[PDB]
């Protein structure tokens, strides 16, 4: 964690020994969507992806309704991976 | 400006995909070596620029720039040409620094440019170089914009680009307000006949001038009456000396295409008002009076050529002749005896220029054709007619027929027998749709040509000529057009500064013989050192009347127009003045196109492309996305099957339209069949 990165500020900046939650962002910047799916399940990864795209488009004062963004997010999270073959034709 | 052009790309240079973002920037070592304004504005921005005014190329290929050397705070007049490294070694002062008329600086703190492009103030002992002039950092065509120091950079870029696309009119009047760079940039472009050696004029006409030199000899200069340029514009050269005058070595002796009395002239001076008028001048549209169509103010001559060649073939030799088969005697009236047209025949689209016939060969006939030829008794006429017809949407006279031959021993290419070129010329007026522009990047097509009487006039009865729009000025930061309008009105009416009790406070730094000027006088504000705003106010206050005692324009620069249509005066005073606009080469007659059914492609069976052929428009990917996003599917099936590729579908659509039946249901496209055959030929079984 490089010294060019700064700590996350919430409610004050992060201290030592501070009790943090499950999906709390430790540093300051952009969280990885692959990890936030693994930690918080597929529900929060819909919330974080919809809010982060809207936070870019509303900076220029452009309004897109969220049902236009939820369509693309639904097409992303279709498939699952295979970690056990079972006994039916599915490669790990 | 097509010469003196620097391009970063080409053979041995980077392409436009290898062109990074860093190479398109303006490095601070461009001051005086390359213009930061003048560049194309498409995808090639920053890769192509032009040289500056005083710049000079090194022996090694670097770009040198002059500088006045100053020794111990005493500005000398020795001039040292300096490249970029030596320009970094020293420090270099400003152009319009207050010299004390001795070589000394007025203030001890002068603006300066440091090594890495830093801009600092400095005590005046350290300064060892000074610029030669303002407008050193700028190009040729950008130094012809008046009031450049008030505009932005993007609209100045658009003005410098659109200044060179002006067309030559028939009259070509010099601009009222300009810079000093018209005379030099016109006599140095070589398109003006310049007397090589001094003497006296013997003989003038519209073709040739013979001066008489000081020692016996004479010299004929031949003009160019209506030569065709490289893009279809006229190239007239009329003389401007009379039969008794005395010319000196270097005097302008004949105008060029876009010149008037030597200097450049790209358009006309037109009265303008800056009100928005009934939504016709809405969102960069320009309305005009009918006086410009009537008095031929804006009218260019365009000259095109058509070329055909009689050559040999397998079956015989094609001949240029009057006897064209299956043709009437109505179209054979304008043709003369050897097949080509006469000189002066006004032609329309689809008429015969050169009557050429090919040996057809042997073909079998349909029985209906056979019995129709038996019914009317007409013969076979075994040679096929392929003439040169003037293409779609063209007209005008026929100027000149330059016809080569083989028998007269001309250098013709191998296998050709007779070459012939016909020159058609038309006289285009102005029209709604044509693109007009000023000198500050305020472009805009012509919205509606009003008649003369429904055009808002002054309190004198003088109608305005064009009407610009208000909302396009303040959001584009190009109020140089408003300053040029004010100073143009001052230069048209003429002024007289009343120095009865002393020269007034605004004009204390004006030159002499600018305290008063005649009407229709010319002035010249240079680029970065010109007419101040306070001097503009002072000139606009004292603005001597027209014919009566009538000051039509008050001190604000505005006038009280009357509505030419309703009748009542407009309730607020409106800015008027004399602007300078040019007619660009974006006319409508080179853009309007249509197609019902024309030619088709070779490998695939789509229609062809472009106005040069007949061609149809491109219904690309994103428009298919829009048609899908509507839910409209039947129109997509139409446009993708029975207008482009259904080879048995097109003729059924045409027959159904002509007979008046419903359109049949479409079929598969031939482009898909070609896809299938290529996939089968790549060893891929596609069933």
């Amino acid at each position: 964690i490089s010294k060019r990165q700064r700590l996350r500020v919430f409610k004050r900046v992060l201290s030592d020994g501070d009790h943090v939650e499950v999906g709390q962002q430790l540093m300051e910047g952009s969280a990885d969507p692959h990890e936030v799916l693994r930690v918080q399940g597929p529900r929060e990864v819909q919330i974080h992806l919809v809010r982060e795209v809207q936070e870019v488009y509303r900076a220029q004062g452009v309004s897109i309704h969220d049902k236009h963004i939820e369509v693309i997010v639904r097409q992303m999270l279709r498939r699952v991976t295979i970690i056990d073959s079972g006994s039916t034709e599915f490669l790990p | 400006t097509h010469k003196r052009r620097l391009s970063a790309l080409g053979p041995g240079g980077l392409s436009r995909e290898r062109a990074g973002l860093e190479v398109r920037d303006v490095h601070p070592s461009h001051y005086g070596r390359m213009c930061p304004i003048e560049t194309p504005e498409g995808p090639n921005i920053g890769l192509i620029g032009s040289l500056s005014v005083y710049a000079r190329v090194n022996p090694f290929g670097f770009i040198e720039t002059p500088y006045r050397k100053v020794v111990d705070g005493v500005v000398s007049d020795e001039i040292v040409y300096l490249t970029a490294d030596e320009e970094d070694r020293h420090v270099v002062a400003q152009a319009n620094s207050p010299i004390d008329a001795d070589g000394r600086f007025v203030e001890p703190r002068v603006l300066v440019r440091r090594k890495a492009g830093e801009v600092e103030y400095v005590p005046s002992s350290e300064v060892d170089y000074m610029d030669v002039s303002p407008r050193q950092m700028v190009s040729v065509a950008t130094a012809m914009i008046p009031f450049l120091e008030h505009d932005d950079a993007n609209r100045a870029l658009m003005g410098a680009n659109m200044q060179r696309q002006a067309v030559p009119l028939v009259r070509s009047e010099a601009p009222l307000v300009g810079t000093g760079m018209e005379l030099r940039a016109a006599i140095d472009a070589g398109d003006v006949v310049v007397a090589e050696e001094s003497g006296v004029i013997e003989e003038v006409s519209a073709d040739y001038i013979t001066v008489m030199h000081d020692n016996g000899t004479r010299r004929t200069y031949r003009m160019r009456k209506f030569a065709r340029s490289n893009h279809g514009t006229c190239a007239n050269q009329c003389p401007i000396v009379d039969a008794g005058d005395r010319v000196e070595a270097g005097q302008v002796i004949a105008d060029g295409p876009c010149t008037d009395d030597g200097e450049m002239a790209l358009g006309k001076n037109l009265l303008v008002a800056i009100m928005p008028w009934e939504g016709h001048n809405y969102e960069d549209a320009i309305i005009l009076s009918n006086r410009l169509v009537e008095e031929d103010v804006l009218t260019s001559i365009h000259i095109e050529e058509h070329e055909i060649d009689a050559r040999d073939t397998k079956l015989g030799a094609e001949e240029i002749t009057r006897d064209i088969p299956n043709i009437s005697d109505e179209v054979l009236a304008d043709l003369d005896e050897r097949g080509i047209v006469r000189i002066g025949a006004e032609v329309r689209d689809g008429d015969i220029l050169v009557g050429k016939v090919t040996p057809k060969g042997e073909t079998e006939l349909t029985p209906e054709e056979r019995l129709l030829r038996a019914i009317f008794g007409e013969k076979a006429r075994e040679v096929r007619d392929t003439s040169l017809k003037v293409p779609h949407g063209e007209s005008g006279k026929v100027i000149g027929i330059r016809v080569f031959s083989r028998e007269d021993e001309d250098e013709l290419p191998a296998g050709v027998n007779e070459l012939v070129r016909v020159y058609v010329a038309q006289k285009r007026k102005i029209s709604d749709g044509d693109k007009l522009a000023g000198r500050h990047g305020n472009k805009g097509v012509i919205g509606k040509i009003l008649p003369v009487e429904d055009m808002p006039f002054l309190a004198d009865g003088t109608p305005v000529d064009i009407i610009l729009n208000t909302h396009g000025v303040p959001r584009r930061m190009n109020i140089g057009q408003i300053l040029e309008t004010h100073l143009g009105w001052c230069a048209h009416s003429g002024w007289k500064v009343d120095a009865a009790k002393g020269v007034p406070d605004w004009a204390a730094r004006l030159p002499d013989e600018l305290l008063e000027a005649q009407p229709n006088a010319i002035v010249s504000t240079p680029v970065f050192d010109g007419a101040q705003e306070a001097e503009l106010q002072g000139l606009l206050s004292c603005t001597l009347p027209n014919r009566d005692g009538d000051v039509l324009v008050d001190a604000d620069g505005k006038a009280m127009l009357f509505d030419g249509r309703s009748g009542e005066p407009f309730p607020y005073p409106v800015t008027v003045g004399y602007m300078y606009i040019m007619k660009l080469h974006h006319l409508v007659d080179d853009k309007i196109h249509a197609r019902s059914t024309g030619p088709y492609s070779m490998i695939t069976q789509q229609p062809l492309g472009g106005k040069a052929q007949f061609g149809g428009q491109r219904f690309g990917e994103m428009e298919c996305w829009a048609m899908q996003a509507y839910g409209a599917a039947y129109t997509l099936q139409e446009l993708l099957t029975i207008k482009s590729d259904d080879t048995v579908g097109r003729v059924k659509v045409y027959e159904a339209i002509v007979k008046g039946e419903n359109i049949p249901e479409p079929g598969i496209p031939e482009s898909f069949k070609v896809l299938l055959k290529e996939l089968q030929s790549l060893c891929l079984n596609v069933e």
Binding site: - | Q628, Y630, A632, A633, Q637, G667, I668, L684
Partner: protein, 56 residues
């Protein structure tokens, strides 16, 4: 995108298209399954009503 690398392993697995999406009907030139192309709207019977039939 990547027309070669899609096509070469599609031919290995003997993958058979079903013409069910939206881009393939645009390619082969049949009527797309969206908007006025679906079976609910493409198979509408249109006839005059019986009362207006008798009045002519």
């Amino acid at each position: 995108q990547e027309t070669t690398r899609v096509l070469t392993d599609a031919a290995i697995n003997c993958r058979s298209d079903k013409l069910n999406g939206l881009k393939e009907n645009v390619i082969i030139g049949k009527l797309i399954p969206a908007g006025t192309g679906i079976n609910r709207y493409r198979n509408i019977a249109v006839q005059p009503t019986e009362e207006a039939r008798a009045a002519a």
